[PDB]
Every structure is written in C-alpha cells, then in structure tokens.
Amino acid sequence: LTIEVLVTVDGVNFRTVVLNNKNTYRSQLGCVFFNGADISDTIPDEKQNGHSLYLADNLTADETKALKELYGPVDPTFLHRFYSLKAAVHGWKMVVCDKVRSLKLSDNNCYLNAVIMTLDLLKDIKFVIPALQHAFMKHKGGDSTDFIALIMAYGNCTFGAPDDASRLLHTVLAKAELCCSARMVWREWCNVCGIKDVVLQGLKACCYVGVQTVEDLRARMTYVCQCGGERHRQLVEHTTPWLLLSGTPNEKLVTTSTAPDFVAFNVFQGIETAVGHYVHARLKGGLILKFDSGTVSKTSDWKCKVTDVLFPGQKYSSDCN
Amino acid sequence: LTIEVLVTVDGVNFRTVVLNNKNTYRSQLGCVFFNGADISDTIPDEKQNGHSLYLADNLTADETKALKELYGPVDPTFLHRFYSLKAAVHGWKMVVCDKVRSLKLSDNNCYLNAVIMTLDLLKDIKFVIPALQHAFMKHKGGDSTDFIALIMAYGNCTFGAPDDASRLLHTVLAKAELCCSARMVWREWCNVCGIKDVVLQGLKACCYVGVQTVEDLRARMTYVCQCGGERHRQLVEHTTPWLLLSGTPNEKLVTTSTAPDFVAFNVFQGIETAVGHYVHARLKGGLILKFDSGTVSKTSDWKCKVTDVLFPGQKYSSDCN
Ligand SMILES: [Zn+2]
Numbered sequence: 001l002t003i004e005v006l007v008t009v010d011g012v013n014f015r016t017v018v019l020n021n022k023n024t025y026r027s028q029l030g031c032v033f034f035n036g037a038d039i040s041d042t043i044p045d046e047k048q049n050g051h052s053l054y055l056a057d058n059l060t061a062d063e064t065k066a067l068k069e070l071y072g073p074v075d076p077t078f079l080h081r082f083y084s085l086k087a088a089v090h091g092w093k094m095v096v097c098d099k100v101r102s103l104k105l106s107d108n109n110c111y112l113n114a115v116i117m118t119l120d121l122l123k124d125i126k127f128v129i130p131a132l133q134h135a136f137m138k139h140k141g142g143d144s145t146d147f148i149a150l151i152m153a154y155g156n157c158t159f160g161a162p163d164d165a166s167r168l169l170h171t172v173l174a175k176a177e178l179c180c181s182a183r184m185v186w187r188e189w190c191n192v193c194g195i196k197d198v199v200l201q202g203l204k205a206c207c208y209v210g211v212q213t214v215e216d217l218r219a220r221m222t223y224v225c226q227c228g229g230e231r232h233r234q235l236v237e238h239t240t241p242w243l244l245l246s247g248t249p250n251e252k253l254v255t256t257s258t259a260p261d262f263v264a265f266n267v268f269q270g271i272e273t274a275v276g277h278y279v280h281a282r283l284k285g286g287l288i289l290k291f292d293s294g295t296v297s298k299t300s301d302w303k304c305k306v307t308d309v310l311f312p313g314q315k316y317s318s319d320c321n
Numbered sequence: 322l323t324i325e326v327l328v329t330v331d332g333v334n335f336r337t338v339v340l341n342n343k344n345t346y347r348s349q350l351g352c353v354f355f356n357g358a359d360i361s362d363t364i365p366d367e368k369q370n371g372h373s374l375y376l377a378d379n380l381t382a383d384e385t386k387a388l389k390e391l392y393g394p395v396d397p398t399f400l401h402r403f404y405s406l407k408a409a410v411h412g413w414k415m416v417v418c419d420k421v422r423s424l425k426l427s428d429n430n431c432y433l434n435a436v437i438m439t440l441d442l443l444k445d446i447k448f449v450i451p452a453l454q455h456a457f458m459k460h461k462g463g464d465s466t467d468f469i470a471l472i473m474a475y476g477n478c479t480f481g482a483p484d485d486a487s488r489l490l491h492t493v494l495a496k497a498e499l500c501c502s503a504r505m506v507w508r509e510w511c512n513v514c515g516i517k518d519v520v521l522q523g524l525k526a527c528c529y530v531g532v533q534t535v536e537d538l539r540a541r542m543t544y545v546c547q548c549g550g551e552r553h554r555q556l557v558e559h560t561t562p563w564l565l566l567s568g569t570p571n572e573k574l575v576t577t578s579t580a581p582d583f584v585a586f587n588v589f590q591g592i593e594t595a596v597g598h599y600v601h602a603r604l605k606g607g608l609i610l611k612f613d614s615g616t617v618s619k620t621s622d623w624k625c626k627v628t629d630v631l632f633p634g635q636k637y638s639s640d641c642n
Pocket residue numbers: 190191192193194225226227228229230231
C-alpha cells in the first residue's frame with residue numbers, strides 16, 4: 001500500500017512524496033509533525049493520504065532555501081524546537097485587562113510576559129524575518145501562539161525553565177528594524193589628543209545597556225587619557241522614536257508624583273530566592289500598574305529592582321558654555 | 322577619598338579610572354565584577370586601589386572593539402552572563418577515567434557532558450573566536466571552567482536548566498572552522514528536467530541533521546517532480562576528516578559484534594519522564610563505554626535512543642551502472 005502526502009517547511013511551498021505503509025515516516029522521509037505532534041516513529045496510514053506534513057530535517061535544497069527565506073539562517077534543530085514549542089505554548093493563556101494583554105503565569109514564563117508587554121509598547125518597528133513579522137501581526141490581532149513559540153525558538157528558551165528577560169528583548173530586537181530615522185552620537189575627547197565621534201543609527205540608537213535613566217545616559221564620564229591627562233565620553237546628540245534602557249536589577253524608589261518621562265519598566269524580584277520573578281510595570285492615569293503575569297496592582301510609589309526602562313522619543317543636542 | 326582601578330573587558334587592554342568612595346561602582350562606572358563577584362552595588366574601598374576590574378556594561382568605544390575582537394559580536398547581556406556562569410561552573414567537577422574526561426552530574430548539566438565529550442573527539446577544528454579557542458586549549462590542558470562557561474554563554478544556557486545537546490553541539494561548531502579540506506556533493510535530478518549539484522565545504526560538509534548512519538546518508542530519495550515524473554536526491558561525493566550525524570532520539574540496537582565504523586554516539590533517556598537525561602557513549606576495546614556524567618558502564622549490545630553519532634573521515638564517490 002502507498003500514499004501521497006504534501007510536505008512543507010513553510011506552509012507555502014509543498015512537495016508531493018509517495019510513502020508505503022511498511023517503514024516509519026522517519027525511515028522514509030525524516031522527522032515530521034502533523035497537527036502539532038511528532039509522528040516520525042509511526043507508520044504511514046491510508047488515513048493521512050492527501051494530507052500536509054511539516055518536515056523538521058532532511059530537507060531538500062528547495063526546502064533549505066524556503067526555510068532561510070521564511071525564518072532566516074537558523075540552526076539545524078530550529079524547526080524541531082519551534083514545532084514542539086508551538087504545541088506546548090498552546091496550552092498557555094493571554095488575558096486582557098482594560099485592553100492591555102498579559103501572559104498568565106505558567107511553566108516559569110514570567111520573563112516572557114515582561115518581554116511581550118515591553119515589545120507591545122514599541123512604535124515604528126518591523127521584523128526583518130518574515131515568520132516573525134507575520135507572527136507579530138497575528139499576535140497584535142489576538143492570536144499569540146506562534147509569536148511566543150518563535151521568540152522562545154529564536155531565544156533558545158527551554159520550555160519550563162526561567163530565563164533572562166533583558167537577554168530576550170535584546171535578541172528579539174536584533175531581528176527588527178526601525179521604520180523611521182534614529183540617531184545617537186557619542187563624543188569621546190581629550191583637550192590635548194583630539195575628538196572621536198561614534199554614530200549609531202536605527203534600532204541601535206534606541207537601546208542602551210548599562211544605564212536606566214536619560215540623566216545617566218547623558219552624563220559626562222571621565223578617565224585617564226593615554227597622554228597622561230583626562231579623557232571624556234559624553235552623549236552629544238540623540239534622536240529616536242523611543243528609547244529602551246537596561247541594567248542589572250537595581251533597587252530604586254519609583255514614583256509618579258514627579259510625572260517622570262518613562263512609560264514602562266520591568267522589575268526582577270528575589271535574586272537569591274532560587275533566582276526570582278519578573279513583573280512588567282506601566283505608567284498610566286498617574287499610577288504605576290504592575291502586571292504580574294496576568295494579575296494587576298496599582299500604586300503611586302514603588303521600591304523595586306528595575307531592569308529595563310522604556311522612554312518616549314528623544315530629541316537631544318548637548319549644550320554647555 | 323579617591324582610588325585608581327584598572328578596568329578591562331578582555332584581561333589584555335586596561336584603562337585607568339579614578340573613583341571616589343561616595344557613590345557605588347554602578348553609579349560611577351557600571352556593572353563590574355571582581356574576583357568572580359558582581360560588586361556594582363558596593364562602594365569603592367581603599368583596599369581595591371590599583372586592582373583590576375572586569376566591566377560588564379557601559380563600555381567605551383575602545384572596549385566595544387576589544388569585546389568584538391575577543392568574543393565576536395555578542396548581545397549586550399553576554400559579559401554579565403559569562404562572568405556569572407564562570408563563577409557558578411567553578412563549583413563543578415571534571416573526572417578522568419583511563420584518560421577520558423567527563424563532567425560530573427550537577428545542576429542538570431548532563432547535556433554539557435554529552436557536548437564536551439563529543440567535541441573532545443574532533444580533529445582538525447579550531448574556533449574562529451579567540452576567547453573560545455583560548456578556552457578550548459585551557460580545557461585540553463585540564464582547566465575546563467572557561468570553556469564550559471563560554472559554551473553556556475554562547476548557547477544561552479540557563480544555569481540549572483536542562484538543555485538540548487544536539488542544539489549546543491551545532492551552535493558551538495558554528496563557531497569553529499576546519500583546518501583541512503572537506504567536501505560534500507548532493508545531486509538532485511530528473512531524467513527529463515536535468516541535474517542540480519549542491520556542494521558544501523569545510524565544517525558544513527562534516528555535520529548532517531536528519532540521518533544517524535552513513536548508509537542512510539548515502540541512500541537515494543525520490544519524490545514527485547514538477548514535470549509530473551520523479552525527482553531524486555542523492556549524496557554523490559563525500560570527503561571529510563570526520564562526520565557528525567544527528568536526529569531526534571531514535572531507539573536502536575547498538576552492537577559492537579559487527580565492528581561498526583562509528584566511534585561514539587549520544588543517547589537521550591526518558592522523553593516523557595519530565596524530559597530526560599543524556600549519556601555519552603564511546604567504542605573502545607570491542608565494547609560500548611557509557612559515560613553517564615562522570616560514571617562509566619560497558620556492554621557489547623545496547624538498546625537505546627540515539628541522538629548524535631560520530632563517524633571517522635569519509636572518502637566516498639557514488640557508483641552504479
Ligand atoms: Zn590625551
């Protein structure tokens with residue numbers, strides 16, 4: 001007995017393969033998923049004749065190219081991992097409180113809540129990888145399974161293990177590009193040795209690791225110059241549609257009484273308590289809304305360990321003397 | 322009161338920075354490690370005057386370039402993660418049984434044992450990233466801490482979480498290059514439509530995901546051609562110094578009675594038992610040596626779920642008719 005199946009890695013391009021009912025899918029074809037399950041070690045059945053199969057390895061040259069076109073360059077384990085993640089993340093739940101989407105706590109996914117709620121605030125970004133852009137749109141439309149499974153696949157997250165929200169934000173945003181101009185100019189100088197400018201553009205101008213405030217970002221740093229004198233580093237121009245700043249968890253008193261310019265921030269709780277818990281915070285209606293994995297609390301003042309902080313567009317040129 | 326410290330990201334290039342004993346290291350400089358601990362939120366002390374500090378963020382332009390030169394392009398969280406991993410992996414232990422190095426089980430690190438024991442068998446490889454090459458040499462010399470912490474940092478492993486050994490092998494080997502020639506030629510053809518060759522070279526010619534035997538690798542695959550006929554794919558030439566093959570865990574009867582050509586393989590145990598345990602196996606003295614995280618067992622026959630399999634150099638040209 002034989003069957004015909006349609007094999008794809010992308011859900012767009014299909015090849016017809018004829019199989020028997022003697023050997024496994026694995027022996028005949030490779031690692032294959034159907035309707036979310038790995039069926040490699042089963043024997044093909046009359047029932048699946050004419051059906052579509054998702055192939056995870058052993059790909060033809062055409063499939064290798066379709067893979068790169070939809071997913072970018074990925075490691076050889078990436079389809080298996082994405083297809084298994086997609087199956088697993090399907091049993092998670094997104095809730096919406098006053099139109100704000102949050103991921104309910106399950107399987108140590110609190111870092112994913114922090115990542116997704118932060119990416120949801122960003123304007124003028126598009127993913128240069130088609131699968132991610134397409135999933136991002138579905139997520140915006142209320143269907144978040146693919147986008148979450150993809151972030152996990154690209155981020156090398158192991159289902160059920162805690163992970164680093166800042167690391168993931170930055171890996172996800174490395175796959176994105178800005179749909180407008182942004183620019184960041186650092187000047188390094190010595191009054192004897194001269195001046196060097198470093199210019200960053202696009203998304204690179206909008207993220208910075210190592211400070212968590214615009215005041216700190218813009219401050220002058222000074223250290224020993226190679227001439228024996230002093231050398232300085234300072235931000236002299238900054239123009240962006242938004243600005244994300246990150247550092248290691250840093251205890252701070254956060255207050256809305258001062259109408260601060262940041263719009264949102266993440267918090268990591270309990271470093272030594274078997275390494276902790278992420279909470280996403282937004283500033284709205286004069287209060288701090290704390291979104292703790294599909295739960296919300298409000299306060300005007302909060303002492304907490306801040307990690308990432310989001311600011312509105314910058315339009316800065318430095319001025320002195 | 323003020324002090325001078327030497328700041329580095331690479332242990333080769335140092336800048337002198339003058340600090341006070343009023344503010345934290347974090348406020349003055351950034352995230353900093355000393356002797357393996359993060360001291361960012363401490364106040365600098367007379368005692369550390371003249372000492373070297375490892376900076377993890379807020380890097381100058383020179384440091385950014387030193388970072389790329391030693392580590393390659395890495396995400397902005399990579400130093401913090403590497404320096405914390407290095408501190409943590411220090412409490413692990415490597416044991417050597419008849420000159421074979423294995424990593425003792427701790428904190429779900431069995432996948433790392435599988436990865437490191439497999440990389441230890443590979444000839445003619447060098448890492449194109451200096452930190453990895455230098456750590457790899459130290460590891461070969463009996464000092465494995467850096468190499469293990471680096472594999473974890475580059476692999477985005479979360480200390481204490483299980484992980485995918487095949488994924489890690491392939492990510493590590495993506496950072497390596499072969500010191501000799503290797504070549505792999507696939508031919509795709511239809512007797513009506515024509516012939517396309519795909520040639521892979523270097524390390525790419527030496528790894529393949531989706532089969533676990535050279536017989537399977539070399540077999541002919543056939544499916545529907547776009548002309549309405551039949552289309553085939555077959556390996557026609559293969560020349561390498563070694564060959565690593567991987568697939569999803571696959572129950573097999575492994576025996577030495579047949580003097581098989583593979584030299585080693587990994588096994589993953591218990592998929593549904595809260596996803597399992599890795600064991601590294603080597604073939605020596607007519608037996609299978611099973612290295613289960615710093616433990617060894619021997620047998621001539623083993624029914625087990627094979628994942629990666631290592632073979633000696635290939636020298637193949639296909640022949641028929
Ligand atoms: Zn100077």
